[PDB]
Amino acid sequence: MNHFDTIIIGGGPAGMMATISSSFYGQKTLLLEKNKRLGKKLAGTGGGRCNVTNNGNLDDLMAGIPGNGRFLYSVFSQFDNHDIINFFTENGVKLKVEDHGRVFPVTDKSRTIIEALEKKIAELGGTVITNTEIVSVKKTDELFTVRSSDQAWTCQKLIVTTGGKSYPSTGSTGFGHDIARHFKHTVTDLEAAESPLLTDFPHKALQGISLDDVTLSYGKHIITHDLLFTHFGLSGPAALRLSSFVKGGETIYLDVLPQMSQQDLADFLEEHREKSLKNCLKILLPERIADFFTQPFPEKVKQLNLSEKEALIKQIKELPISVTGKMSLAKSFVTKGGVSLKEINPKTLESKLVPGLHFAGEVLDINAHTGGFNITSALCTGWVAGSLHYD
Numbered sequence: 193m194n195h196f197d198t199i200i201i202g203g204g205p206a207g208m209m210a211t212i213s214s215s216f217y218g219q220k221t222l223l224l225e226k227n228k229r230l231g232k233k234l235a236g237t238g239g240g241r242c243n244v245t246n247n248g249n250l251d252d253l254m255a256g257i258p259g260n261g262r263f264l265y266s267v268f269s270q271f272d273n274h275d276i277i278n279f280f281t282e283n284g285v286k287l288k289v290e291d292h293g294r295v296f297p298v299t300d301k302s303r304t305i306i307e308a309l310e311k312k313i314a315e316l317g318g319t320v321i322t323n324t325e326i327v328s329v330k331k332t333d334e335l336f337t338v339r340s341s342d343q344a345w346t347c348q349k350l351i352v353t354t355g356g357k358s359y360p361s362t363g364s365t366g367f368g369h370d371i372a373r374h375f376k377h378t379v380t381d382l383e384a385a386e387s388p389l390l391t392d393f394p395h396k397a398l399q400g401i402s403l404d405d406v407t408l409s410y411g412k413h414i415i416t417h418d419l420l421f422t423h424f425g426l427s428g429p430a431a432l433r434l435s436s437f438v439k440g441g442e443t444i445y446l447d448v449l450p451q452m453s454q455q456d457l458a459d460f461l462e463e464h465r466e467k468s469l470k471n472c473l474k475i476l477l478p479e480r481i482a483d484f485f486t487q488p489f490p491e492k493v494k495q496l497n498l499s500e501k502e503a504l505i506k507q508i509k510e511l512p513i514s515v516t517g518k519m520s521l522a523k524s525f526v527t528k529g530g531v532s533l534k535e536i537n538p539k540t541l542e543s544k545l546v547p548g549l550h551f552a553g554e555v556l557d558i559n560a561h562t563g564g565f566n567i568t569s570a571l572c573t574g575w576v577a578g579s580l581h582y583d
């Protein structure tokens with residue numbers, strides 16, 4: 193018995209959720225995964241802790257999915273970030289909410305998430321065959337044939353959830369784009385998004401340090417969020433978002449305290465004209481950031497003159513950084529681009545050109561910010577694709 197109602201290709205967050213919803217709707221379901229493990233990429237989101245969704249409202253979500261979020265109104269009315277939170281709560285996983293509405297398991301371990309998903313697939317009788325790479329997908333009359341090098345399976349409904357093109361060592365190497373092409377869909381241009389930034393800058397002084405809520409500016413686009421200093425330059429949300437507007441050759445500007453304007457700072461110093469300038473700023477900033485700003489200046493806040501005060505403050509508020517480029521698609525967190533949404537039903541996620549065929553997750557031309565919006569996007573679209581609609 194190799195024939196199923198539904199076959200789902202790719203066991204990421206989209207694939208797992210379609211397997212759950214399809215089974216739940218009485219569909220006899222097969223999930224195929226190329227790796228020995230499910231959720232290889234998912235296991236590494238949120239610094240490996242697993243950033244499973246975001247707890248904001250609908251507008252927070254739309255602001256979180258800049259790349260074609262508007263297509264998801266229909267999907268989100270069926271299953272949303274709060275349906276996700278319910279599911280994991282219902283099934284005995286303790287979630288928690290961190291900054292910017294990011295949702296993690298209390299365990300801080302991605303296996304708590306993936307293991308819960310596998311457990312449900314099993315309670316619902318879903319079939320999963322791992323360590324199996326699909327190489328071929330055809331359709332005859334009303335019957336999809338799905339083939340690996342060894343075997344073949346059949347179905348009437350086919351869900352393709354093979355992901356994007358970034359981090360191909362997770363398994364997302366584009367096969368779902370080939371399917372889409374084979375059945376004569378348009379695949380848009382595939383390019384990097386949420387790609388960390390290469391800077392020309394003394395990286396050693398600051399790498400590993402994290403900063404909460406800072407403003408990076410460049411031309412019209414100005415962004416206020418979290419930032420990580422890396423050995424190659426800049427990552428974390430702020431860098432990641434800005435990375436869409438920048439290619440290499442630009443100067444961008446960093447505001448390390450968007451809270452205080454020039455004057456508040458000036459006043460703050462006078463209150464601590466007794467401590468060392470490093471120690472002064474050590475109270476407002478992480479220590480290694482303090483070192484960085486105040487190395488070239490006099491030891492003590494009072495030893496400063498007027499011109500030193502004004503120059504220092506302008507560095508604190510407007511440090512110019514030189515960007516020499518960004519990471520490629522391969523090394524970016526998100527693929528901007530995918531299967532074209534003008535040929536997909538926004539409500540069922542069925543292809544408009546081939547009946548029975550469906551697409552969910554990153555394989556579609558949807559792209560979002562890190563912070564749970566991609567994963568939320570994949571679980572939901574997955575849920576919908578796997579679910580049944582009739583009329």
Ligand SMILES: Cc1cc2nc3c(=O)[nH]c(=O)nc-3n(C[C@H](O)[C@H](O)[C@H](O)COP(=O)(O)OP(=O)(O)OC[C@H]3O[C@@H](n4cnc5c(N)ncnc54)[C@H](O)[C@@H]3O)c2cc1C
Pocket residue numbers: 201202203204205206207224225226227230231232233234236237238243324325326327353354355356358359362363364365366367368524525526552553554555560561562563564565566567568570
């Ligand atoms: C380091 C990192 C951190 C991230 N952090 C975040 C974050 O904090 N928040 C956020 O929202 N997003 C984040 N993302 C993005 C997010 O992980 C993805 O957008 C999401 O996992 C996509 O889900 P998916 O199921 O569509 O594709 P994937 O999760 O990639 O899964 C696709 C699956 O298809 C399988 N497959 C592929 N080809 C075949 C084939 N031929 N045969 C069989 N199986 C196949 C693959 O093995 C894979 O398991 C991050 C990405 C990375 C790389």
